[PDB]
Design a protein around this ligand. Structure first.
Ligand SMILES: [Cl-]
Ligand SMILES: [Cl-]
Ligand SMILES: [Cl-]
Ligand SMILES: [Cl-]
Ligand SMILES: [Cl-]
Ligand SMILES: [Cl-]
Ligand SMILES: [Cl-]
Ligand SMILES: [Cl-]
Ligand SMILES: [Cl-]
Ligand SMILES: [Cl-]
Ligand SMILES: [Cl-]
Ligand SMILES: [Cl-]
Ligand SMILES: [Cl-]
Ligand SMILES: [Cl-]
Ligand SMILES: [Cl-]
Ligand SMILES: [Cl-]
Ligand SMILES: [Cl-]
Ligand SMILES: [Cl-]
Ligand SMILES: [Cl-]
Ligand SMILES: [Cl-]
Ligand SMILES: [Cl-]
Ligand SMILES: [Cl-]
Ligand SMILES: [Cl-]
Ligand SMILES: [Cl-]
Ligand SMILES: [Cl-]
Ligand SMILES: [Cl-]
Ligand SMILES: [Cl-]
Ligand SMILES: [Cl-]
Ligand SMILES: [Cl-]
Ligand SMILES: [Cl-]
Ligand SMILES: [Cl-]
Ligand SMILES: [Cl-]
Ligand SMILES: [Cl-]
Ligand SMILES: [Fe+2]
Ligand SMILES: [Fe+2]
Ligand SMILES: [Fe+2]
Ligand SMILES: [Fe+2]
Ligand SMILES: [Fe+2]
Ligand SMILES: [Fe+2]
Ligand SMILES: [Fe+2]
Ligand SMILES: [Fe+2]
Ligand SMILES: [Fe+2]
Ligand SMILES: [Fe+2]
Ligand SMILES: [Fe+2]
Ligand SMILES: [Fe+2]
Ligand SMILES: [Fe+2]
Ligand SMILES: [Fe+2]
Ligand SMILES: [Fe+2]
Ligand SMILES: [Mg+2]
Ligand SMILES: [Mg+2]
Ligand SMILES: [Mg+2]
Ligand SMILES: [Mg+2]
Ligand SMILES: [Mg+2]
Ligand SMILES: [Mg+2]
Ligand SMILES: [Mg+2]
Ligand SMILES: [Mg+2]
Ligand SMILES: [Mg+2]
Ligand SMILES: [Mg+2]
Ligand SMILES: [Mg+2]
Ligand SMILES: [Mg+2]
Ligand SMILES: [Mg+2]
Ligand SMILES: [Mg+2]
Ligand SMILES: [Mg+2]
Ligand SMILES: [Mg+2]
Ligand SMILES: [Mg+2]
Ligand SMILES: [Mg+2]
Ligand SMILES: [Mg+2]
Ligand SMILES: [Mg+2]
Ligand SMILES: [Mg+2]
Ligand SMILES: [Mg+2]
Ligand SMILES: [Mg+2]
Ligand SMILES: [Mg+2]
Ligand SMILES: [Mg+2]
Lengths: 172, 172, 172, 172
């Protein structure tokens, strides 16, 4: 019943709230990875800062969904932000593998929201996802995949010298 | 039979001409609102200038449809620009309510043209509407809705002090 | 057993993790207030931006506790970030009253952590709280109290003109 | 009997002189590490310069205690600066392990002086230690711990290539 609401299905409104939550969950997982790589017994500061920056990006993505919801006349409904799946992330390779799976989980949720928007004939929501989320996700998945290939080439997890070299030449 | 024409359905060509006319109609309605708020017995100059700027925006939107029509090899066909529904617009709240309904009428026509372009499998016309019209319409509807909420909060239509305050702090 | 750990009690390590969580909870509550004041049927954008900025400040406070934990050789342990107490915040006065109580809840948790650090004879943790958190909390509580006094003076919750005036002259 | 003396216990005056001596001892140990890494048969110049800079920092810390003593009306009493525990420091890992233990010895002496100042109700001396010494010590211990983690990852002491890489990418 919002005065601005036009062509905005209840199902899309709810799916935007769920997508908002998933972006916040992804942010929190990257915060955990930042804190792990900043541990004195891990101490890979460029890796830590890579994940801290990703945490900020995902929070920005969540805030853009809040703004979107209000622009369309939907109502932001928040739920708990679940803690990350792990308390410790092993090493740079294990963390990047977890980041790749997280990025693909977020991408699948964005693609599913695009399919719902398509089914409800919502071109504005389709354009928003295509213009503000789907290309960044493909770029992020490619970047992380490239890093995993390099970490395997550098002999992770066993090769500690390879892990050091990655921190000093791939994320400086 | 234009040498440039490719994947451009006659129905979409005609609907672009009708959409062009509606943009010119919207421009003319905003011109009327400008002239009303510039009356000596209305005298809300920042409100008048808000509507004058919207009149120019809608004329620009119409000219972009003329250029689009020619780029695709369609032919611009003009019809009369109907005078606005009212000769006088009451007060800032009544005018903003009329502007919200006008913006939603224009938005519905753009969404209907997007559905026709989708049915005729015209991705260029879909992209044009998504990239050049649909996001501006959502932003404009949100802005006007926000203003209506504030005018009601300020006690319009009865509260003349509230109307003055809006002119001096919301559209300066 | 961290190689850096010195004079850092397990109880203080755990209380820092709980304090981290409370800062994230406070951030999330301010995010909710931002989204509420950005609604088309609320539409107090300077109030919304005040709360959005507070949301960012509290996230920064949480990240500083993560860095602190690692500097001392403690281990960051994350828990769920609980959703805010309300889904809607009434009006500027109700939201500022909720913000004052939230700031005093955070302040009481910081004072309780300072008392634990005092009992465990941890001057570094005491100094950190005194230098990085306790003075900002007193300033924030004073600012919000001052705003509540002004909102009451302006006739909130009933006086919508007063609410408009506050948005346009106290948080611009 | 100094005209400036107020709330300055004899025990704190003596403990400041002992703390002064320990800072000079720490400076001298870092001087020894500088000279070791500058040897032609060691030749890790960035490591050498790291330790030379730490030697200067500790001398500055000692001079600040001399100034403090005089500000409070105590009297500087100097003792011999004992030569460092070792004449040669093995390799970058052995030296960093010795530096970590030295930093924790200095930190424990600062914490013990803070406890004495607390027992004698000397808030000025407490503030001085908290503001000028205790946070730098936590930062220094964290930095050295992080370096030790990286040197172990790089295969020290056996992996000479790892030692070279550290000199060229961690302390450049
Ligand atoms: Cl709708
Ligand atoms: Cl529709
Ligand atoms: Cl619906
Ligand atoms: Cl929902
Ligand atoms: Cl659950
Ligand atoms: Cl785990
Ligand atoms: Cl995942
Ligand atoms: Cl969905
Ligand atoms: Cl054609
Ligand atoms: Cl085709
Ligand atoms: Cl055709
Ligand atoms: Cl036509
Ligand atoms: Cl007619
Ligand atoms: Cl009329
Ligand atoms: Cl209309
Ligand atoms: Cl149509
Ligand atoms: Cl300890
Ligand atoms: Cl101690
Ligand atoms: Cl303990
Ligand atoms: Cl814990
Ligand atoms: Cl619970
Ligand atoms: Cl509620
Ligand atoms: Cl609270
Ligand atoms: Cl506590
Ligand atoms: Cl005295
Ligand atoms: Cl005294
Ligand atoms: Cl005495
Ligand atoms: Cl002495
Ligand atoms: Cl002796
Ligand atoms: Cl020796
Ligand atoms: Cl030592
Ligand atoms: Cl002492
Ligand atoms: Cl290299
Ligand atoms: Fe994202
Ligand atoms: Fe991403
Ligand atoms: Fe990204
Ligand atoms: Fe338009
Ligand atoms: Fe597009
Ligand atoms: Fe418009
Ligand atoms: Fe516009
Ligand atoms: Fe004013
Ligand atoms: Fe905070
Ligand atoms: Fe104190
Ligand atoms: Fe605060
Ligand atoms: Fe603040
Ligand atoms: Fe020192
Ligand atoms: Fe130090
Ligand atoms: Fe230092
Ligand atoms: Mg309504
Ligand atoms: Mg619904
Ligand atoms: Mg979910
Ligand atoms: Mg759980
Ligand atoms: Mg793009
Ligand atoms: Mg690349
Ligand atoms: Mg021809
Ligand atoms: Mg035709
Ligand atoms: Mg028409
Ligand atoms: Mg007629
Ligand atoms: Mg766009
Ligand atoms: Mg706005
Ligand atoms: Mg260890
Ligand atoms: Mg413990
Ligand atoms: Mg808690
Ligand atoms: Mg719950
Ligand atoms: Mg005490
Ligand atoms: Mg201060
Ligand atoms: Mg003030
Ligand atoms: Mg004398
Ligand atoms: Mg004496
Ligand atoms: Mg001594
Ligand atoms: Mg001797
Ligand atoms: Mg300090
Ligand atoms: Mg560091």
């Amino acid at each position: 019943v919002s005065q601005v609401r036009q062509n905005y299905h209840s199902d899309c409104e709810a799916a935007v709230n769920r997508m908002l939550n998933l972006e916040l969950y992804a942010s929190y997982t990257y915060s955990s990875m930042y804190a792990f790589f900043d541990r004195d017994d891990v101490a890979l500061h460029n890796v830590a800062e890579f994940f801290k920056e990703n945490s900020h990006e995902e929070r920005e993505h969540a805030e853009k969904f809040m703004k979107y919801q209000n622009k369309r006349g939907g109502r932001v409904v928040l739920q708990d932000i679940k803690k990350p799946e792990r308390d410790e992330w092993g090493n740079t390779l294990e963390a990047m593998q977890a980041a790749l799976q997280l990025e693909k989980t977020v991408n699948q949720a964005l693609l599913d929201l695009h399919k719902l928007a398509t089914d409800k004939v919502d071109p504005h929501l389709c354009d928003f996802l295509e213009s503000e989320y789907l290309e960044e996700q493909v770029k992020d998945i490619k970047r992380i995949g490239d890093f995993i290939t390099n970490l395997k080439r550098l002999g992770l997890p066993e090769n500690g010298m390879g892990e050091y070299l990655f921190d000093k030449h791939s994320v400086k």
